[PDB]
Design a protein around this nucleic acid. Structure first.
Length: 71
RNA sequence: UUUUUUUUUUUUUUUUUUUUUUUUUUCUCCUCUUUUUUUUUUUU
């Protein structure tokens, strides 16, 4: 959310993402558009689970629809 | 009744070349609660 992105900096490489089913952990990915996609569902993938992190790594894949409209 | 003389616009042209997007950082990060997980069946 915004008030916790304006504090990430404004060129915040690393970011944390919240999945949609409770069965999945959170994923560590690096992007540079977080401050203009805060009203959209997105898609990510997974490349490697690393042990010096508590989370698994990923990378953005493609955009999805908008949170609020049926589509 | 007032003669004679005091030069002028720098000279030159017939020289070789075998490279190549960019370029250089920012850390670890507590996801709250009825559950085992339901399940045949038929009309698309």
């Amino acid at each position: 959310s915004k008030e916790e992105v304006q504090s990430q900096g404004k060129n915040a490489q690393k970011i944390l993402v919240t999945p949609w089913d409770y069965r999945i952990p959170k994923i560590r990915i690096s992007t540079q558009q977080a401050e203009t996609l805060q009203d959209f569902r997105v898609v990510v993938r997974i490349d490697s689970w690393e042990s010096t992190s508590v989370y698994p790594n990923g990378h953005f894949v493609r955009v999805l629809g908008r949170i609020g409209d049926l589509e």
